[PDB]
Amino acid sequence: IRAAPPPLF
Amino acid sequence: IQRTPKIQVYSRHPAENGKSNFLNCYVSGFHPSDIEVDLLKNGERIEKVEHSDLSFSKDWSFYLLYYTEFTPTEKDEYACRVNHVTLSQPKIVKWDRDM
Amino acid sequence: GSHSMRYFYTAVSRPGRGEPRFISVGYVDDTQFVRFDSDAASPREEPRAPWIEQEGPEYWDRNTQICKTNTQTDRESLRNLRGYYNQSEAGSHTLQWMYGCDVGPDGRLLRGYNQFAYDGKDYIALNEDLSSWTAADTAAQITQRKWEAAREAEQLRAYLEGTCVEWLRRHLENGKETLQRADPPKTHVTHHPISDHEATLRCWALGFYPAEITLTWQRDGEDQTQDTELVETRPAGDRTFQKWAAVVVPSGEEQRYTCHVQHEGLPKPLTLRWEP
């Protein structure tokens, strides 16, 4: 499974 | 900030006139990702051409395989024509069955 | 052997032509297994290898939702990034993400990766410790400070040590007929006269998997590094790869030259000569 999206830059 | 495409044109299997094969144009080492690639038979655009999904190498440069079924002959000439922001005019690389 | 699972993300802005395109692909070793494209008629995580198709609806839906959320985060972060570099809203920009895990023969974590580039240049990377960050410039330092405040490294470490390795091991078992099969190169040397006094000897490796290979020419047993033309390893389109190395040799000297091939699929390295 993919990782969660990172926080906003 | 921009990296120009490397281009290889070649077949999936060693070429044998009259036998069906795949014609490949591999573009790689380029940035940005926007690129146009045509495969040519006797100077004309081949209509049915597919390509791989956009991915990139460890150095972040992009690569794509463009391909089509073809049956090479003695006299039919094949080539890959590439345009990219780094190029002032399209680059044409002719297929050479020994490369 | 050792194995890897890697996901690759590319987001590309296109002002005046809609929202940034988001495309992402997943690999195990040199085999692609999924794609997602925001420009697809119906964007969803799609199978790109046969062995992944057995995964249930839950797999497909969860990865689809992840990619949809990531499409939105990448788009907002592209707006942040433009500001970090004082850039106008008029030009196109690229954000790339790679993460994944390497495991040894025994299935254990060798190392994890999580890193980003903006306009083709390294921006920020999780260190090998899976705990601290390296920022390439003062803009990335802004992002680092945010991610440190959010303790984002800790979430990444859990993913890379746990989920990533666990799913890689699963993929390797489901795809064991292909992912755990090395196909050795088929090798031969060709000879191409250039002139009355020189010819090219080209050593070919064809039909091999995985892509990693070493092809070298020696002359009287000395490596010809500076005098060898070595093309980039290229995909054949049938999962396998191709490569050649070529050397320009004085006429009559061909037998002094030997080609040496190493690949995981070979018991021992091969040495070849031109065979007239």
PDB file of C-alpha atoms in Angstrom, chain C residues 1-143:
ATOM      1  CA  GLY C   1      18.575 -11.676  -3.780  1.00  0.00           C
ATOM      2  CA  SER C   2      17.849  -8.202  -2.413  1.00  0.00           C
ATOM      3  CA  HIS C   3      14.705  -6.382  -3.432  1.00  0.00           C
ATOM      4  CA  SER C   4      13.072  -2.935  -3.354  1.00  0.00           C
ATOM      5  CA  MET C   5       9.623  -1.360  -3.484  1.00  0.00           C
ATOM      6  CA  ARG C   6       9.582   2.227  -4.749  1.00  0.00           C
ATOM      7  CA  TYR C   7       6.800   4.713  -5.556  1.00  0.00           C
ATOM      8  CA  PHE C   8       7.494   7.643  -7.925  1.00  0.00           C
ATOM      9  CA  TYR C   9       5.317  10.806  -8.064  1.00  0.00           C
ATOM     10  CA  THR C  10       5.435  13.614 -10.623  1.00  0.00           C
ATOM     11  CA  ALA C  11       3.244  16.717 -10.393  1.00  0.00           C
ATOM     12  CA  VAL C  12       3.536  19.291 -13.163  1.00  0.00           C
ATOM     13  CA  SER C  13       1.815  22.686 -13.173  1.00  0.00           C
ATOM     14  CA  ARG C  14       0.463  24.096 -16.445  1.00  0.00           C
ATOM     15  CA  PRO C  15      -0.932  27.589 -15.835  1.00  0.00           C
ATOM     16  CA  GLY C  16      -3.816  28.456 -18.209  1.00  0.00           C
ATOM     17  CA  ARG C  17      -4.303  24.741 -19.038  1.00  0.00           C
ATOM     18  CA  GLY C  18      -6.089  23.451 -15.964  1.00  0.00           C
ATOM     19  CA  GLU C  19      -4.741  22.058 -12.699  1.00  0.00           C
ATOM     20  CA  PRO C  20      -1.304  20.394 -12.267  1.00  0.00           C
ATOM     21  CA  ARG C  21      -1.171  16.884 -13.687  1.00  0.00           C
ATOM     22  CA  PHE C  22      -0.350  14.241 -11.084  1.00  0.00           C
ATOM     23  CA  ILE C  23       1.068  10.917 -12.264  1.00  0.00           C
ATOM     24  CA  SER C  24       2.460   8.225  -9.965  1.00  0.00           C
ATOM     25  CA  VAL C  25       3.810   4.727 -10.536  1.00  0.00           C
ATOM     26  CA  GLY C  26       4.840   1.853  -8.194  1.00  0.00           C
ATOM     27  CA  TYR C  27       7.758  -0.583  -8.819  1.00  0.00           C
ATOM     28  CA  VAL C  28       9.053  -3.727  -7.248  1.00  0.00           C
ATOM     29  CA  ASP C  29      12.655  -3.957  -8.405  1.00  0.00           C
ATOM     30  CA  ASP C  30      12.539  -3.230 -12.188  1.00  0.00           C
ATOM     31  CA  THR C  31       8.900  -4.254 -12.562  1.00  0.00           C
ATOM     32  CA  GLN C  32       6.186  -1.595 -12.594  1.00  0.00           C
ATOM     33  CA  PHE C  33       3.001  -2.764 -10.863  1.00  0.00           C
ATOM     34  CA  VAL C  34       0.591   0.224 -10.494  1.00  0.00           C
ATOM     35  CA  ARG C  35      -0.121   3.622 -12.001  1.00  0.00           C
ATOM     36  CA  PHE C  36      -2.357   6.576 -11.173  1.00  0.00           C
ATOM     37  CA  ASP C  37      -2.976   9.512 -13.546  1.00  0.00           C
ATOM     38  CA  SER C  38      -5.149  12.531 -12.661  1.00  0.00           C
ATOM     39  CA  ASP C  39      -5.670  13.103 -16.449  1.00  0.00           C
ATOM     40  CA  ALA C  40      -7.249   9.646 -16.874  1.00  0.00           C
ATOM     41  CA  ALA C  41     -10.946   9.476 -17.877  1.00  0.00           C
ATOM     42  CA  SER C  42     -11.556   7.849 -14.474  1.00  0.00           C
ATOM     43  CA  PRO C  43      -8.524   8.415 -12.194  1.00  0.00           C
ATOM     44  CA  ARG C  44      -7.824   5.339 -10.031  1.00  0.00           C
ATOM     45  CA  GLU C  45      -4.964   3.116  -8.895  1.00  0.00           C
ATOM     46  CA  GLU C  46      -4.575   0.743 -11.871  1.00  0.00           C
ATOM     47  CA  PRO C  47      -2.818  -2.658 -12.088  1.00  0.00           C
ATOM     48  CA  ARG C  48       0.220  -2.737 -14.385  1.00  0.00           C
ATOM     49  CA  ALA C  49       1.554  -6.264 -13.514  1.00  0.00           C
ATOM     50  CA  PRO C  50      -0.473  -9.509 -13.527  1.00  0.00           C
ATOM     51  CA  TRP C  51       0.381 -10.617  -9.934  1.00  0.00           C
ATOM     52  CA  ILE C  52      -1.091  -7.464  -8.353  1.00  0.00           C
ATOM     53  CA  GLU C  53      -4.582  -8.067  -9.861  1.00  0.00           C
ATOM     54  CA  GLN C  54      -5.503 -10.581  -7.126  1.00  0.00           C
ATOM     55  CA  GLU C  55      -5.548  -7.792  -4.514  1.00  0.00           C
ATOM     56  CA  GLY C  56      -9.101  -7.119  -3.276  1.00  0.00           C
ATOM     57  CA  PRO C  57     -11.323  -4.002  -3.700  1.00  0.00           C
ATOM     58  CA  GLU C  58     -10.044  -2.617  -0.387  1.00  0.00           C
ATOM     59  CA  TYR C  59      -6.489  -2.374  -1.815  1.00  0.00           C
ATOM     60  CA  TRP C  60      -7.689  -0.609  -4.954  1.00  0.00           C
ATOM     61  CA  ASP C  61     -10.004   1.819  -3.185  1.00  0.00           C
ATOM     62  CA  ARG C  62      -7.552   2.772  -0.427  1.00  0.00           C
ATOM     63  CA  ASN C  63      -4.713   3.460  -2.890  1.00  0.00           C
ATOM     64  CA  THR C  64      -7.114   5.390  -5.100  1.00  0.00           C
ATOM     65  CA  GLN C  65      -8.184   7.567  -2.163  1.00  0.00           C
ATOM     66  CA  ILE C  66      -4.529   8.114  -1.186  1.00  0.00           C
ATOM     67  CA  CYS C  67      -3.675   9.310  -4.732  1.00  0.00           C
ATOM     68  CA  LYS C  68      -6.695  11.612  -4.912  1.00  0.00           C
ATOM     69  CA  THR C  69      -5.686  13.274  -1.614  1.00  0.00           C
ATOM     70  CA  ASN C  70      -2.042  13.438  -2.813  1.00  0.00           C
ATOM     71  CA  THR C  71      -3.170  15.146  -6.054  1.00  0.00           C
ATOM     72  CA  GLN C  72      -4.634  17.924  -3.909  1.00  0.00           C
ATOM     73  CA  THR C  73      -1.684  18.189  -1.495  1.00  0.00           C
ATOM     74  CA  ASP C  74       0.822  18.344  -4.425  1.00  0.00           C
ATOM     75  CA  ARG C  75      -1.185  21.124  -6.066  1.00  0.00           C
ATOM     76  CA  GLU C  76      -1.290  23.221  -2.883  1.00  0.00           C
ATOM     77  CA  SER C  77       2.395  22.524  -2.166  1.00  0.00           C
ATOM     78  CA  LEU C  78       3.282  23.617  -5.748  1.00  0.00           C
ATOM     79  CA  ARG C  79       1.634  26.980  -4.865  1.00  0.00           C
ATOM     80  CA  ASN C  80       3.767  27.156  -1.672  1.00  0.00           C
ATOM     81  CA  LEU C  81       6.910  26.266  -3.598  1.00  0.00           C
ATOM     82  CA  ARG C  82       6.367  28.996  -6.191  1.00  0.00           C
ATOM     83  CA  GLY C  83       6.200  31.511  -3.303  1.00  0.00           C
ATOM     84  CA  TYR C  84       9.334  30.079  -1.617  1.00  0.00           C
ATOM     85  CA  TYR C  85      11.266  30.970  -4.739  1.00  0.00           C
ATOM     86  CA  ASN C  86       9.487  34.270  -5.495  1.00  0.00           C
ATOM     87  CA  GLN C  87       8.293  32.817  -8.832  1.00  0.00           C
ATOM     88  CA  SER C  88       5.439  34.161 -10.964  1.00  0.00           C
ATOM     89  CA  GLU C  89       2.228  32.229 -11.459  1.00  0.00           C
ATOM     90  CA  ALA C  90       2.880  32.143 -15.238  1.00  0.00           C
ATOM     91  CA  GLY C  91       5.515  29.385 -15.575  1.00  0.00           C
ATOM     92  CA  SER C  92       5.297  25.579 -15.341  1.00  0.00           C
ATOM     93  CA  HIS C  93       7.009  23.821 -12.381  1.00  0.00           C
ATOM     94  CA  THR C  94       7.608  20.220 -11.331  1.00  0.00           C
ATOM     95  CA  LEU C  95       7.431  18.475  -7.950  1.00  0.00           C
ATOM     96  CA  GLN C  96       8.785  14.915  -7.724  1.00  0.00           C
ATOM     97  CA  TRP C  97       8.593  12.446  -4.812  1.00  0.00           C
ATOM     98  CA  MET C  98      10.214   9.046  -4.410  1.00  0.00           C
ATOM     99  CA  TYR C  99       9.987   6.786  -1.336  1.00  0.00           C
ATOM    100  CA  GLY C 100      10.372   3.100  -0.631  1.00  0.00           C
ATOM    101  CA  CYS C 101      12.319   0.362   1.075  1.00  0.00           C
ATOM    102  CA  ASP C 102      15.221  -1.983   0.256  1.00  0.00           C
ATOM    103  CA  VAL C 103      15.253  -5.467   1.861  1.00  0.00           C
ATOM    104  CA  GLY C 104      17.939  -8.186   1.945  1.00  0.00           C
ATOM    105  CA  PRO C 105      17.610 -11.898   0.947  1.00  0.00           C
ATOM    106  CA  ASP C 106      16.147 -12.499   4.409  1.00  0.00           C
ATOM    107  CA  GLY C 107      13.314  -9.955   4.043  1.00  0.00           C
ATOM    108  CA  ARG C 108      14.774  -7.503   6.559  1.00  0.00           C
ATOM    109  CA  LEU C 109      15.009  -3.743   6.049  1.00  0.00           C
ATOM    110  CA  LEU C 110      18.316  -2.586   4.587  1.00  0.00           C
ATOM    111  CA  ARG C 111      17.253   1.052   4.319  1.00  0.00           C
ATOM    112  CA  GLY C 112      14.315   3.341   3.558  1.00  0.00           C
ATOM    113  CA  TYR C 113      14.051   6.485   1.381  1.00  0.00           C
ATOM    114  CA  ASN C 114      11.748   9.474   1.239  1.00  0.00           C
ATOM    115  CA  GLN C 115      12.865  12.447  -0.824  1.00  0.00           C
ATOM    116  CA  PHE C 116      11.711  15.225  -3.110  1.00  0.00           C
ATOM    117  CA  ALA C 117      12.863  17.439  -5.917  1.00  0.00           C
ATOM    118  CA  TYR C 118      11.509  20.736  -7.255  1.00  0.00           C
ATOM    119  CA  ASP C 119      12.166  21.593 -10.891  1.00  0.00           C
ATOM    120  CA  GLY C 120      14.565  18.615 -11.125  1.00  0.00           C
ATOM    121  CA  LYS C 121      16.732  19.738  -8.195  1.00  0.00           C
ATOM    122  CA  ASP C 122      17.007  18.013  -4.802  1.00  0.00           C
ATOM    123  CA  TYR C 123      14.776  19.818  -2.330  1.00  0.00           C
ATOM    124  CA  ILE C 124      14.398  17.830   0.901  1.00  0.00           C
ATOM    125  CA  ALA C 125      15.259  14.238   1.887  1.00  0.00           C
ATOM    126  CA  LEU C 126      14.599  12.083   4.920  1.00  0.00           C
ATOM    127  CA  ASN C 127      18.029  10.906   6.192  1.00  0.00           C
ATOM    128  CA  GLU C 128      18.980   7.211   6.386  1.00  0.00           C
ATOM    129  CA  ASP C 129      18.202   7.398  10.130  1.00  0.00           C
ATOM    130  CA  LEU C 130      14.484   7.839   9.156  1.00  0.00           C
ATOM    131  CA  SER C 131      14.506  10.495  11.854  1.00  0.00           C
ATOM    132  CA  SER C 132      16.076  13.738  10.570  1.00  0.00           C
ATOM    133  CA  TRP C 133      15.973  15.806   7.376  1.00  0.00           C
ATOM    134  CA  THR C 134      18.435  17.280   4.925  1.00  0.00           C
ATOM    135  CA  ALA C 135      17.190  20.489   3.226  1.00  0.00           C
ATOM    136  CA  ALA C 136      18.964  21.589   0.038  1.00  0.00           C
ATOM    137  CA  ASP C 137      18.369  25.328   0.399  1.00  0.00           C
ATOM    138  CA  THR C 138      16.715  28.028   2.481  1.00  0.00           C
ATOM    139  CA  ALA C 139      13.314  27.331   0.883  1.00  0.00           C
ATOM    140  CA  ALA C 140      13.490  23.623   1.884  1.00  0.00           C
ATOM    141  CA  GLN C 141      14.475  24.730   5.405  1.00  0.00           C
ATOM    142  CA  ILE C 142      10.969  26.288   5.669  1.00  0.00           C
ATOM    143  CA  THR C 143       9.417  22.925   4.772  1.00  0.00           C
TER     144      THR C 143
END
